[PDB]
Design a protein around this motif. Structure first.
Motif, mmCIF file in Angstrom:
data_model
loop_
_atom_site.group_PDB
_atom_site.id
_atom_site.type_symbol
_atom_site.label_atom_id
_atom_site.label_comp_id
_atom_site.label_asym_id
_atom_site.label_seq_id
_atom_site.Cartn_x
_atom_site.Cartn_y
_atom_site.Cartn_z
ATOM 1 N N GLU A 356 51.395 85.522 22.002
ATOM 2 C CA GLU A 356 51.940 84.763 23.131
ATOM 3 C C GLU A 356 51.165 84.980 24.439
ATOM 4 O O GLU A 356 51.557 84.432 25.460
ATOM 5 C CB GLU A 356 53.453 85.046 23.338
ATOM 6 C CG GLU A 356 54.326 84.887 22.092
ATOM 7 C CD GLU A 356 54.192 83.612 21.275
ATOM 8 O OE1 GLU A 356 53.958 82.532 21.867
ATOM 9 O OE2 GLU A 356 54.316 83.699 20.029
ATOM 10 N N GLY A 357 50.084 85.756 24.392
ATOM 11 C CA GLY A 357 49.252 86.042 25.561
ATOM 12 C C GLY A 357 49.946 86.943 26.562
ATOM 13 O O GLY A 357 49.641 86.886 27.758
ATOM 14 N N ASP A 358 50.892 87.777 26.071
ATOM 15 C CA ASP A 358 51.700 88.675 26.901
ATOM 16 C C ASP A 358 51.059 90.046 26.991
ATOM 17 O O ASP A 358 51.420 90.974 26.267
ATOM 18 C CB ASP A 358 53.173 88.699 26.416
ATOM 19 C CG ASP A 358 54.158 89.544 27.219
ATOM 20 O OD1 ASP A 358 53.721 90.236 28.175
ATOM 21 O OD2 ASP A 358 55.356 89.554 26.860
ATOM 22 N N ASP A 359 50.090 90.156 27.893
ATOM 23 C CA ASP A 359 49.271 91.345 28.175
ATOM 24 C C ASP A 359 48.557 91.071 29.500
ATOM 25 O O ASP A 359 48.262 89.914 29.793
ATOM 26 C CB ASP A 359 48.219 91.570 27.060
ATOM 27 C CG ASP A 359 47.372 92.822 27.255
ATOM 28 O OD1 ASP A 359 47.749 93.884 26.717
ATOM 29 O OD2 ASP A 359 46.320 92.734 27.927
ATOM 30 N N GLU A 360 48.274 92.111 30.294
ATOM 31 C CA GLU A 360 47.628 91.909 31.597
ATOM 32 C C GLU A 360 46.216 91.287 31.503
ATOM 33 O O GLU A 360 45.837 90.562 32.411
ATOM 34 C CB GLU A 360 47.618 93.185 32.440
ATOM 35 C CG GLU A 360 46.958 94.403 31.809
ATOM 36 C CD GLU A 360 46.853 95.588 32.759
ATOM 37 O OE1 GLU A 360 47.453 95.542 33.862
ATOM 38 O OE2 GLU A 360 46.156 96.563 32.400
ATOM 39 N N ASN A 361 45.462 91.551 30.407
ATOM 40 C CA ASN A 361 44.154 90.947 30.155
ATOM 41 C C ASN A 361 44.220 89.668 29.304
ATOM 42 O O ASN A 361 43.187 89.223 28.794
ATOM 43 C CB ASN A 361 43.210 91.977 29.520
ATOM 44 C CG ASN A 361 42.764 93.021 30.500
ATOM 45 O OD1 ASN A 361 42.209 92.706 31.546
ATOM 46 N ND2 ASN A 361 43.055 94.279 30.221
ATOM 47 N N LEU A 362 45.427 89.072 29.149
ATOM 48 C CA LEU A 362 45.558 87.798 28.419
ATOM 49 C C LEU A 362 46.125 86.711 29.292
ATOM 50 O O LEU A 362 46.965 86.993 30.142
ATOM 51 C CB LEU A 362 46.389 87.938 27.116
ATOM 52 C CG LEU A 362 45.747 88.761 25.990
ATOM 53 C CD1 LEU A 362 46.633 88.774 24.751
ATOM 54 C CD2 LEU A 362 44.349 88.230 25.623
ATOM 55 N N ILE A 363 45.658 85.459 29.087
ATOM 56 C CA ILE A 363 46.252 84.265 29.702
ATOM 57 C C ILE A 363 46.956 83.540 28.559
ATOM 58 O O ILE A 363 46.295 83.246 27.554
ATOM 59 C CB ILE A 363 45.187 83.333 30.387
ATOM 60 C CG1 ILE A 363 44.387 84.081 31.486
ATOM 61 C CG2 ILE A 363 45.848 82.051 30.958
ATOM 62 C CD1 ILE A 363 42.920 83.535 31.783
ATOM 63 N N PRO A 364 48.282 83.238 28.655
ATOM 64 C CA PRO A 364 48.893 82.377 27.618
ATOM 65 C C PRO A 364 48.264 80.989 27.705
ATOM 66 O O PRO A 364 48.033 80.503 28.814
ATOM 67 C CB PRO A 364 50.390 82.344 28.001
ATOM 68 C CG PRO A 364 50.580 83.477 28.960
ATOM 69 C CD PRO A 364 49.268 83.643 29.678
ATOM 70 N N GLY A 365 47.976 80.373 26.558
ATOM 71 C CA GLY A 365 47.329 79.074 26.526
ATOM 72 C C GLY A 365 45.914 79.136 27.070
ATOM 73 O O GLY A 365 45.094 79.939 26.611
ATOM 74 N N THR A 366 45.635 78.290 28.068
ATOM 75 C CA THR A 366 44.299 78.160 28.661
ATOM 76 C C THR A 366 44.332 78.169 30.168
ATOM 77 O O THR A 366 45.319 77.755 30.771
ATOM 78 C CB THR A 366 43.572 76.901 28.121
ATOM 79 O OG1 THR A 366 42.252 76.899 28.653
ATOM 80 C CG2 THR A 366 44.291 75.583 28.491
ATOM 81 N N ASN A 367 43.242 78.648 30.778
ATOM 82 C CA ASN A 367 43.033 78.526 32.221
ATOM 83 C C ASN A 367 42.475 77.117 32.556
ATOM 84 O O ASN A 367 42.435 76.745 33.723
ATOM 85 C CB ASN A 367 42.067 79.630 32.720
ATOM 86 C CG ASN A 367 40.734 79.661 32.009
ATOM 87 O OD1 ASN A 367 40.655 79.645 30.782
ATOM 88 N ND2 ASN A 367 39.653 79.761 32.758
ATOM 89 N N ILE A 368 42.052 76.334 31.532
ATOM 90 C CA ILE A 368 41.385 75.036 31.780
ATOM 91 C C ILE A 368 42.410 73.931 32.010
ATOM 92 O O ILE A 368 43.269 73.694 31.169
ATOM 93 C CB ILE A 368 40.379 74.664 30.642
ATOM 94 C CG1 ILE A 368 39.366 75.814 30.340
ATOM 95 C CG2 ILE A 368 39.668 73.320 30.888
ATOM 96 C CD1 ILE A 368 38.391 76.305 31.520
ATOM 97 N N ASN A 369 42.305 73.253 33.136
ATOM 98 C CA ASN A 369 43.078 72.057 33.440
ATOM 99 C C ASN A 369 42.407 70.792 32.837
ATOM 100 O O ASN A 369 41.218 70.551 33.068
ATOM 101 C CB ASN A 369 43.259 71.937 34.961
ATOM 102 C CG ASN A 369 43.801 70.609 35.449
ATOM 103 O OD1 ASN A 369 44.690 69.993 34.844
ATOM 104 N ND2 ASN A 369 43.302 70.164 36.592
ATOM 105 N N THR A 370 43.182 70.001 32.062
ATOM 106 C CA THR A 370 42.722 68.744 31.461
ATOM 107 C C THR A 370 43.566 67.564 31.982
ATOM 108 O O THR A 370 44.797 67.647 31.979
ATOM 109 C CB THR A 370 42.665 68.824 29.909
ATOM 110 O OG1 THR A 370 43.963 69.104 29.385
ATOM 111 C CG2 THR A 370 41.669 69.864 29.397
ATOM 112 N N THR A 371 42.887 66.467 32.425
ATOM 113 C CA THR A 371 43.450 65.266 33.075
ATOM 114 C C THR A 371 44.372 65.611 34.251
ATOM 115 O O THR A 371 44.081 66.527 35.019
ATOM 116 C CB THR A 371 44.129 64.300 32.072
ATOM 117 O OG1 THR A 371 45.260 64.929 31.464
ATOM 118 C CG2 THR A 371 43.166 63.757 31.014
#
Ligand SMILES: O=C(c1cccc(F)c1)N1CC=CC1
Ligand SMILES: [Cl-]
Ligand SMILES: [Cl-]
Ligand SMILES: [Mg+2]
Length: 371
Positions: A356-371
């Motif tokens: 689930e990206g639940d860690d200080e060095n993880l981003i859940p999903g993506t940092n990239i914005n699309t549309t």
């Protein structure tokens, strides 16, 4: 140094080529080993891989001789030709390398998976996406060890769409063929390894948990995961490590019924690539995506451990994050995902929160914005 595995099992390594031809299977096997007192495994085992690397980097092949001087004696911590640990059936991972790579360059991943009780088959692709690979022209050449080398193909812009798609399809076929080879060895089919190595393949009889099969790969190997899943239902789930989605045909996206996990670097990804990953999603399908903070594309490959920090950051082999920190997150989150979708009875669910990206060095999903 390439890190040792974090799991409780010692790790062995060997190479298997069957048949000996350019259409046969070539893989590096990582496996739980009985013994821990063998010689470590030579990381890049032939001078021609350095020539290939030099060609891929766009330098004179004499830079190859320099790479060989610097890296030619480097080992990876797996017991070369160690006997297989007996008395247990192991789940199987088939692993696909990136563009310009080859079978030996993801040992940090293969060793870690093996240390947790996986057999790992790291395929070497013959689609001319490897920096270099070899095979034998015929039976006589295999006998005397007369190798024919195949080097990376450079494409014109006009060749990109078509040739990358032909390559990802060959790559999937190569993953399926490696699976069938290991499953026939597990039965007890006699196979004469085209390499004359002191590892008896008979050991692998009755050693595979035949239902517990996954496909994992980096970059071009991440697209190979997806193509392979859509074409071979024997693979039960896939993990795409910073997938490069460009090679995939339009038809594949709606055709992946298996659970699929995307583990991305922060600095590689871009909207066209993220949009393609999102095309794999449907409400009836299991999909997960995490991004490792401060990471670069090469954080998934062994070259992230091959140099110091300054030179590493310069050559984009390292990111802002520590390389051991990043690979531990990718490997632990992979283990929790594999336990869930292969139905393993291990303790890998201790890392469920990393899915689930639940860690200080993880981003859940993506940092990239699309549309
Ligand atoms: O990114 C690199 C790489 C390796 C060493 C030096 C370098 F400047 C770059 N790779 C080589 C094969 C695939 C990716
Ligand atoms: Cl990058
Ligand atoms: Cl883009
Ligand atoms: Mg098939």
């Amino acid at each position: 140094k390439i890190p040792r595995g974090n799991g409780p099992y010692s790790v062995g390594c060997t190479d298997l080529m069957f048949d000996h031809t350019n259409k046969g299977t070539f893989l590096r096997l990582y496996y739980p080993s009985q013994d821990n007192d063998r010689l470590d495994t030579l990381w890049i085992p032939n001078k021609e891989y350095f020539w290939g690397l030099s060609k891929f980097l766009g330098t004179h092949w004499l830079m190859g001789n320099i790479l060989r001087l610097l890296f030619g004696s480097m080992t990876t911590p797996a017991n070369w030709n160690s006997p297989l640990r007996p008395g247990e059936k192991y789940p199987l991972v088939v692993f696909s390398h990136g563009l310009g790579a080859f079978r030996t360059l993801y040992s940090a991943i293969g060793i870690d998976l093996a240390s947790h009780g996986f057999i790992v088959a790291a395929v070497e692709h013959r689609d001319r996406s490897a920096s270099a690979t070899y095979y034998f022209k015929d039976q006589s050449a295999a006998e005397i060890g007369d190798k024919s080398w195949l080097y990376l193909r450079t494409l014109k812009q006009e060749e990109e769409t078509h040739i990358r798609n032909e390559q990802v399809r060959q790559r999937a076929k190569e993953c399926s063929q490696a699976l069938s080879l290991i499953l026939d060895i597990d039965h007890g089919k006699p196979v004469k390894n085209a390499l004359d190595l002191k590892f008896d393949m008979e050991q692998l009889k009755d050693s595979i948990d035949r239902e517990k099969i996954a496909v994992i790969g980096h970059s071009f190997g991440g697209a190979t995961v997806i193509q392979t899943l859509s074409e071979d239902q024997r693979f039960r789930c896939g993990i795409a490590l910073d997938a490069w989605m460009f090679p995939l045909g339009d038809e594949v996206y709606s055709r992946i019924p298996q659970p699929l996990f995307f583990i991305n670097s922060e600095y590689f990804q871009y909207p066209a690539n993220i949009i393609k990953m999102k095309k794999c999603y449907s409400p009836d399908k299991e999909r997960k995506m995490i991004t490792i903070r401060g990471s670069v594309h090469q954080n998934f490959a062994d070259f992230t451990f091959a140099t110091g920090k300054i030179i590493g950051h310069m050559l984009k082999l390292k990111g802002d994050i520590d390389s051991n920190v990043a690979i531990d997150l990718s490997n632990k989150a992979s283990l929790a995902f594999l336990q869930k979708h292969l139905g393993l009875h291990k303790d890998f669910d201790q890392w469920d929160c990393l899915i689930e990206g639940d860690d200080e060095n993880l981003i859940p999903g993506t940092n990239i914005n699309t549309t």
